[PDB]
Amino acid sequence: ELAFSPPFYPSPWADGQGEWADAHRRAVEIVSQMTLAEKVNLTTGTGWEMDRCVGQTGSVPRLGINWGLCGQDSPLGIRFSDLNSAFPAGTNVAATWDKTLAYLRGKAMGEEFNDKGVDILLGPAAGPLGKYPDGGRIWEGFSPDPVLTGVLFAETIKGIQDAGVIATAKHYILNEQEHFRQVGEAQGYGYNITETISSNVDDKTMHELYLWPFADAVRAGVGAVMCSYNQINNSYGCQNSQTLNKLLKAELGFQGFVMSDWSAHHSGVGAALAGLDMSMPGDISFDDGLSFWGTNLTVSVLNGTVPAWRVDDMAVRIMTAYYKVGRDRLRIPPNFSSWTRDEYGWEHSAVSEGAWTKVNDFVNVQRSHSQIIREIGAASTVLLKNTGALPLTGKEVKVGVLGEDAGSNPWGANGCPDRGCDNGTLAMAWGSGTANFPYLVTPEQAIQREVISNGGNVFAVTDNGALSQMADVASQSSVSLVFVNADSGEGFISVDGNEGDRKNLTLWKNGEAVIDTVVSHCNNTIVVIHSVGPVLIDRWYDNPNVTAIIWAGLPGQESGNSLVDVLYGRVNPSAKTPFTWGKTRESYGAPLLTEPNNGNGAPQDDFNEGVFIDYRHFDKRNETPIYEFGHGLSYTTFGYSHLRVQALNSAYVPTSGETKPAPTYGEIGSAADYLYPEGLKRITKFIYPWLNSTDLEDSSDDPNYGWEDSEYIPEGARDGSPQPLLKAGGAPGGNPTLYQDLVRVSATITNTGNVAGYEVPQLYVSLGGPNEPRVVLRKFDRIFLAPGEQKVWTTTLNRRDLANWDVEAQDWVITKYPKKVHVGSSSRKLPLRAPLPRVY
Amino acid sequence: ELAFSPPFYPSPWADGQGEWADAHRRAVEIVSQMTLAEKVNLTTGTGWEMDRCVGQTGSVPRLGINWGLCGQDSPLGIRFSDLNSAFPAGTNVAATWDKTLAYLRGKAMGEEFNDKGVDILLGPAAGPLGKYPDGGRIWEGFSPDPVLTGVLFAETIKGIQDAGVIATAKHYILNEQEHFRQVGEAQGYGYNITETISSNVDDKTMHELYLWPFADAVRAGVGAVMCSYNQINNSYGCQNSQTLNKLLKAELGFQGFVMSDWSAHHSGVGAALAGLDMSMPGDISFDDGLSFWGTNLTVSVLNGTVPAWRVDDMAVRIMTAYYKVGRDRLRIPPNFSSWTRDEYGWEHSAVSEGAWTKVNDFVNVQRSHSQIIREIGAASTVLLKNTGALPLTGKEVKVGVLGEDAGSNPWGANGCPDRGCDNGTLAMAWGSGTANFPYLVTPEQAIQREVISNGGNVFAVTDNGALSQMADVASQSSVSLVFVNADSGEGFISVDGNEGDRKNLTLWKNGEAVIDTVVSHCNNTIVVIHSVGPVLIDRWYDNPNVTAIIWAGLPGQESGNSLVDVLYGRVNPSAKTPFTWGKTRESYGAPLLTEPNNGNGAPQDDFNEGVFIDYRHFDKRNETPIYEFGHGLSYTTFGYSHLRVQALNSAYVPTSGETKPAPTYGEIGSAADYLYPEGLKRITKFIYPWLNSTDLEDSSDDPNYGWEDSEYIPEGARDGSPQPLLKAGGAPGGNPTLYQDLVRVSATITNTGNVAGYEVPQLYVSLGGPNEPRVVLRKFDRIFLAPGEQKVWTTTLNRRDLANWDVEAQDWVITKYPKKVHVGSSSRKLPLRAPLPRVY
Ligand SMILES: *[C@@H]1O[C@H](CO)[C@@H](O[C@@H]2O[C@H](CO)[C@@H](O[C@@H]3O[C@H](CO[C@H]4O[C@H](CO[C@H]5O[C@H](CO)[C@@H](O)[C@H](O)[C@@H]5O[C@H]5O[C@H](CO)[C@@H](O)[C@H](O)[C@@H]5O)[C@@H](O)[C@H](O[C@H]5O[C@H](CO)[C@@H](O)[C@H](O)[C@@H]5O[C@H]5O[C@H](CO)[C@@H](O)[C@H](O)[C@@H]5O)[C@@H]4O)[C@@H](O)[C@H](O[C@H]4O[C@H](CO)[C@@H](O)[C@H](O)[C@@H]4O[C@H]4O[C@H](CO)[C@@H](O)[C@H](O)[C@@H]4O[C@H]4O[C@H](CO)[C@@H](O)[C@H](O)[C@@H]4O)[C@@H]3O)[C@H](O)[C@H]2NC(C)=O)[C@H](O)[C@H]1NC(C)=O
Ligand SMILES: *[C@@H]1O[C@H](CO)[C@@H](O[C@@H]2O[C@H](CO)[C@@H](O[C@@H]3O[C@H](CO[C@H]4O[C@H](CO[C@H]5O[C@H](CO)[C@@H](O)[C@H](O)[C@@H]5O[C@H]5O[C@H](CO)[C@@H](O)[C@H](O)[C@@H]5O)[C@@H](O)[C@H](O[C@H]5O[C@H](CO)[C@@H](O)[C@H](O)[C@@H]5O)[C@@H]4O)[C@@H](O)[C@H](O[C@H]4O[C@H](CO)[C@@H](O)[C@H](O)[C@@H]4O[C@H]4O[C@H](CO)[C@@H](O)[C@H](O)[C@@H]4O)[C@@H]3O)[C@H](O)[C@H]2NC(C)=O)[C@H](O)[C@H]1NC(C)=O
Ligand SMILES: *[C@@H]1O[C@H](CO)[C@@H](O[C@@H]2O[C@H](CO)[C@@H](O[C@@H]3O[C@H](CO[C@H]4O[C@H](CO[C@H]5O[C@H](CO)[C@@H](O)[C@H](O)[C@@H]5O[C@H]5O[C@H](CO)[C@@H](O)[C@H](O)[C@@H]5O)[C@@H](O)[C@H](O[C@H]5O[C@H](CO)[C@@H](O)[C@H](O)[C@@H]5O)[C@@H]4O)[C@@H](O)[C@H](O[C@H]4O[C@H](CO)[C@@H](O)[C@H](O)[C@@H]4O[C@H]4O[C@H](CO)[C@@H](O)[C@H](O)[C@@H]4O)[C@@H]3O)[C@H](O)[C@H]2NC(C)=O)[C@H](O)[C@H]1NC(C)=O
Ligand SMILES: *[C@@H]1O[C@H](CO)[C@@H](O)[C@H](O)[C@H]1NC(C)=O
Ligand SMILES: *[C@@H]1O[C@H](CO)[C@@H](O)[C@H](O)[C@H]1NC(C)=O
């Protein structure tokens, strides 16, 4: 009955090909010098809260790796630190539709992480992709569209890695919701389950939707990939040989390392052989002093179960990432502590051991990164509706600012751990995807400053119970700006019954009544929404007193200043929604899985919609959104003309051949080489690589130690002989003939209005055939045009852009169905269209 | 037995002498043309909420007074309006010790009032003077010191009147507290009394303390005086022949008009003959449709009781004020409504009658008045303590801003009627002494802006219950700034049991615990107090972690900007405390009278301390204040040297002679002249001058109509013959030989530190003799000095400055006790001293 994940073995070994040759060579050179305990140190974290960073490996001080590799959250700024910046969330980056802004944000973040002593940034994210509009972590990623996500994910990775820090593509893969993601956490919420949720997805959907942005990340040169907490067809993400060995390593050709999510590692031998490379934070569960790896990995290799080539490959993949971004020349010891903001603390925080020492140096790493934050906030402010309220001119006599979302968090910008509250303006959602603010500029502050400077009077009512006081201010104002929000986050935090995932898609903090009060008293009401994702606005959006509506996402520390830049027209808004605004929750497709449906076994989440999420689903059901994917307004207008299409073919080459045999590097030795050194003071619960004695069974102490391999290990898992190459593989990101250009497309874009600004033209294709979506996004850019100016936008469609995943062939194939190309300003406003020429 | 107020009659008639000659002449010219109903219209308001302004008289359209004279609150900005400024409170002005700033604030206010169409500003105030540190309205005035108060009151009056608006010196006199000020209000608070509080004071104390600033106001040319709600020796303020006829009109030579406080008028004939000139808002009680004057005043003159010379004198005094400031050329109709902010409303708001019409024209009158407000706020920020925390340099790495008093009122700046709350930053206290803000710059906003511009990180915790959150921010900060407050107001509003008057002298909104939390976690804590008056700080002020303490008063709309100007040293603080900071409540003298002590008659408030209030009391009891009257710190130091004293080459001439007989102007006519015009639609409850019929008794309808004069009118009250001149009278402000200069005094002031700034030198005298305070303030200035610079400060002491009120002689006499002069930086730091030469 249950979804099954078939075996793919062995775990592919790194090949040092292409742009990875130099870093792999330097990795082989150092790993060839390492003993087994040194290798194991790289693969295994030293335990929860045992060092400075949220994750930290063992060290190799004999060879100059003098402190462990340090991994730190988050995808929008350094977590658990100080004197750092708080960037706009991923969903805002997607709303900019701007490759360059995604790159620069990545670079700015990389600089901060580097300057704090961090080796590995735990991000950015393209999983969750965005199947569920109420999924708790959708905002951390980019968009439910895989092409928008993959492009901006890849640019963000390149910025981070150009700054000298290893990026970690996460969460791989199908962790679309928070409910049932972890057994202990589910049990704490009162649910009786004994395994995590299983995401069950067909092979075509996997390739065409969820995997696609990870292909982009690999091709962009991402150093690490983080495996997820959920299962995929009932095999855990950190030991799923299909996703890790076959799709990521054999097909996408990934040459870096796979790192577990925190306590997502569920077996020693099983995970190592199924493609895991690094166990974080290193213990079985936080501070239990046990490890699936560490000592157990040393023993698994000494007893012959995990071949030497596999542990050698782990250490090579890790060191390859290290050398690829230059950690050997850039790394400095972490100069802050995740676990306290005090100057002094215990060296090993979890157990109060080691030296009482200076754990925070107070190093300011902000530089002028406030400028890119302000910029991105303004370029991610989506103007959804504008019947002439905007821009503001500075001649407004009285301005009202209404709603708690305009005001300060009265507990301070950092006053709730992991931002686990919805107090004041919503500039950052909750969980591990967070950073501490250096400050937070509110809409109230920025609007008040600006109104005053223009001679206006201005009043801010920020108590969402004070409805009569709001009504009076609204009645007296020339324009009323009303602020509302909706929040969500990671599932280890629940705010008002939202257990990560949101329990509805409507407004928080009495926002529905706030809107009603203001709109019924002011015929020039502008609604500004800060939110993690879509909100159901059908009830009020079309009221004629609502003269403009803005979605500004989660803008980070410069929130108010970004917003006023757009309100007053210093920046002409250009952002487009990176998701659909539907009429009802049901319009989006299936609800979250929030009740166990497989007894007390793993809840089963069948991805029955296949590729049809967000706009694809609305298009297939012929549903009319309130605001479609790709919609946003400008203070000017843009016209589209002169579509031209030209074939370039001049062929796909399915990859054929064999790998090398699995190499080994560095002598393994025997148990007598790997005892705990005499005179080493063992730190309580710290995870080490060493053995209590030369008796391997006693040093491991596994209760099932020593079975025949075939009782618990799949066939081929230990086979280091040459393996066949997969047809759809061949280079990082897949077969390189996928990236050959087949068609060139041009369209002329004209600023047909009176104000300079950026437009986001979009190019969609129809691949044809029964059950293909009517249109799917393939190209976009953000282009600046003065009034009356024209530019010719030219792009190319490659083989992969026009292909479908053919499950019978196990390859990408351009089908025989007739295709079309469409260019315009959104997924529904597509005035240019033409047939594509036949290419294969 | 009970305090008694002896008769002084007749009510002195205006004489047109000196600077008043031109305006009195025009008043006579116009009043000589008026009929009796026209005269009565000037004297009598038209009823509560019957027109645009808080008070409005009848009109005289036949002679070009085409709408009634408009009186509007408040002493710190226009009340019940829009598009106006909100100025620092009177207590802030006193803290500046700066004559020019006081003048400029009055001028800025006058400009706003004039441009809204208002004739008469209901302010400024010198009553309450400040006998009670917990008195509810002490912040509206200046200082408990009569000289600091009189000088700044006079400069405020001059500014207002130089802008073309009549100033109203209030409240005259001895309304030192709010408890029992009004019968109906006291009964609403559960007290059983049938008359208002009687303030009972000896003659010398009256002259040397409470009356002294009113002398200053009269000499400065104030057009109106407002009489008080309380009794003086058991005769109501608005019919007290001693205070109105004798002290104000006969002795101080006042040539303007006396106006009642609102519903403070308590009889027709009695009050007219005792010296009242204008009844506001014109009804007996609000909207009862009855008047002690109006119809009743017409009848009182027609029946022979109130002589024609008295009603003629009322009209002449009112018109003298109107001409003195130029209302004939400057007046425009009021262009706002006090009773609604909507554009449209009923012409007569109280009864919804007259036309439905445009009552608000939305005229902006702010100009650049924000500049003088910011300036006065900075110049009123008293630096009480500084052990090196200030000024801030911009190098602070992390800045904490703690306390609700830093943050916004979440109901909006104008979210509580008459500011009757203590939400967010305290920039204005409550009651009639208020204005609506155009905006309000909080300390949070301004500090955050400034820190961010310097590269600091900044966090604001504004929930006074969030103590652990404040502790964590305080622990992490380089400097913590903690904001606390204490509020009070007029007695028609009670907040948390403070029935106008404050129920204690300690902090509001959990401030004592906020200070404890911050100071116990940060060794560089700056405390900023916003308050109506003194707060008891003995418990925490001397904690060595409190590195500075500021009292910033009630700074109006620019609060946060005024403050950051001083914090960062753009302004070098120069303010001095205008009251004493004592150790205990008892240190100040007698408690408020808060329980009835005379059965259910008038509570009796005996002013037994005489001239010994505030610093005079501390000095007489040899108590050590925490911070003495006149204390404030600078970022530099000032030295005092080279005292020189010289008797002037240059006697007092007691006034002797007689007045003119009382004049009459305009023919009175008879009852048939003063019927309601045929076809005039009478507005419900509006107050008119006219008679229902020629039967005077029926038109009046007084239940005790028609007694013989001697049964209810004191002897002399109807005597229009020539009267003796009082010895201590002779010109506005009293005998002009009081103001002859007798001694010149010089002292050299040096800036002995390294920062430019203003110093406030102070000159005190000891008048000598057993009954006399050790020192009393006589002269002060604010003088700017560059580092190392010296200036010679020269001033003159006049006859009044060295005199005592001699009760036997009923005159000012320089006594034969030896006197001394003292110069220095506070009432206690007086390094220069010398005997004064004998002068008389
Ligand atoms: C014209 O026309 C006109 C118009 O119309 C008119 O007029 C009118 O007139 C009438 C008569 O006729 C009147 O009436 C009256 O009045 C009175 C007054 O009153 C007021 O005042 C008071 C006070 O007084 C005082 O002061 C003043 C000033 O300020 C003066 O003026 C006076 O004279 C006096 O003097 C005194 O003192 C002083 C000090 O203080 C000094 O300085 C001097 O020298 C002297 O000594 C007051 O009190 C009052 O008050 C009240 O009222 C009010 C209002 O409402 C209120 O608010 C308050 O609070 C109060 O109240 C209370 O009281 C009340 C009753 O009265 C009740 O109801 C309540 O509840 C409460 O409790 C006023 O302000 C009067 O007095 C009178 O009466 C009387 O009598 C009756 C009857 O019998 C009674 O009932 C009452 O009670 C009273 O009694 C008293 O007196 C008597 C005698 O006279 C006696 O016997 C008794 O015992 C008693 O005694 C006591 O007290 C007193 C005081 O009061 C004292 O002095 C003693 O010693 C004791 O202790 C009557 O009412 C009217 O007003 C008029 N009106 C108008 C509109 O103006 C005419 O008439 C015509 N003519 C022809 C020819 O036709
Ligand atoms: C989707 O998911 C969302 C996220 O999980 C979820 O969000 C939640 O939404 C609900 C609403 O749907 C929110 O709850 C509402 O919050 C309102 C605002 O609460 C705050 O303000 C209150 C009012 O304060 C005024 O009144 C006080 C009492 O007089 C004064 O003390 C105040 O000074 C203030 O004054 C103003 O009003 C005075 C007149 O009352 C006036 O004189 C004065 O001048 C001035 O104008 C506070 O009381 C409240 O604080 C109390 O309650 C909270 C908990 O709710 C405590 O933490 C506090 O300690 C304190 O006890 C807040 O500060 C509420 O007004 C609203 O109440 C109404 O509904 C509740 C039950 O639902 C009733 O008990 C109550 O009587 C109210 O009924 C009225 O309205 C309802 C419509 O809602 C109507 O049916 C009814 O007939 C009646 O008219 C309610 O609690 C909640 O905060 C959101 N949570 C989060 C985390 O965001 C959302 O629900 C989900 N969507 C759906 C559809 O499921
Ligand atoms: C002189 O004249 C002055 C002017 O009139 C006069 O002023 C008044 O002073 C008093 C005393 O200082 C003031 O009243 C105090 O106000 C404090 C703050 O109130 C606000 O915050 C409260 C706490 O909020 C936190 O806790 C809540 C409950 O857990 C949470 O829901 C919140 O989210 C918040 O969280 C923080 O703390 C949590 C731990 O608790 C923590 O988990 C979290 O992370 C975070 O850190 C709120 O409860 C309160 O709101 C409630 O109550 C008010 C009424 O007070 C209602 O209007 C609200 O609707 C709501 O129901 C406010 O928002 C209070 O902490 C303090 O409480 C203490 O005293 C009362 C009795 O007086 C006890 O019932 C209470 O248990 C507390 O006891 C503790 O402290 C006292 C010390 O006072 C101690 O003796 C005792 O042993 C114990 O330790 C108190 O109410 C008042 O506001 C002032 N009024 C004005 C107008 O300014 C002054 O008193 C006069 N002077 C004298 C000496 O007479
Ligand atoms: C709003 O209403 C007013 C009066 O009802 C009208 O004059 C104005 O044109 C309206 N403005 C908008 C935004 O339509
Ligand atoms: C406060 O404490 C710090 C401890 O780091 C100390 O270095 C500093 O000199 C102290 N400053 C004051 C204001 O005394």
Numbering used by the authors:
A (entry chain A), B (entry chain B): 21 to 670, 674 to 863
From the primary publication:
β-d-Glucosidases (EC 3.2.1.21) are classical glycoside hydrolases that catalyse the hydrolysis of the nonreducing terminal glucose from β-linked d-gluco-oligosaccharides and aryl-β-d-glucosides. Here, the three-dimensional structures of two industrially important family GH3 β-d-glucosidases from Aspergillus fumigatus and A. oryzae, solved by molecular replacement and refined at 1.95 Å resolution, are reported. Both enzymes, which share 78% sequence identity, display a three-domain structure with the catalytic domain at the interface, as originally shown for barley β-d-glucan exohydrolase, the first three-dimensional structure solved from glycoside hydrolase family GH3.
The subunit–subunit interface within the dimer of the AfβG and AaβG structures spans the α/β-sandwich domain and the extended loop between domains A and B. In AfβG there are an ethylene glycol (between Arg469 NH1 in both chains) and two imidazole molecules (between Arg387 O on one chain and Gly475 O on the other) forming hydrogen bonds between the subunits. AfβG has two molecules of ethylene glycol in the substrate-binding site, occupying subsites +1 and −1, in molecules A and B; the former is hydrogen-bonded to Arg99 NH1 and NH2 and the latter to Asp93 OD1 and OD2 and to Lys190 NZ, as well as to the first ethylene glycol molecule. In molecule A, several molecules of ethylene glycol occupy the substrate-binding cleft, one of which overlays on the MPD molecule at the +4 subsite when superposed on the AaβG structure. In the AfβG structure, for example, FnIII residues 762–764 are hydrogen-bonded to Arg45 and Glu49 of domain A in a symmetry-related molecule. There are 13 potential N-glycosylation sites in the amino-acid sequences of each of AfβG and AoβG, with nine and ten of them being occupied in their respective crystal structures; we have modelled 45 and 46 sugars in chains A and B, respectively, for AfβG, whilst AoβG has 40, 42, 41 and 34 sugars modelled in chains A, B, C and D, respectively. The largest N-glycan is linked to Asn323 in domain A, where it is visible as a complete nine-mannose tree in AfβG and AoβG (chains A and B in the latter, chains C and D having seven and six mannoses, respectively). Furthermore, the A. fumigatus enzyme retains most of its activity at 65°C for at least 19 h, whereas both the A. oryzae and A. niger enzymes retain activity for less than 2 h at this temperature. Within the protomer, AfβG has two extra ion pairs, Lys151–Glu629 and Lys523–Asp516 (in addition, the former is relatively short at 2.6–2.9 Å), and the distance between residues 536 and 559 is shorter than that in AoβG (2.9 Å compared with 3.0–3.7 Å). AfβG is able to form two extra intermolecular salt bridges between Lys418 and Asp102 in both subunits of the dimer.
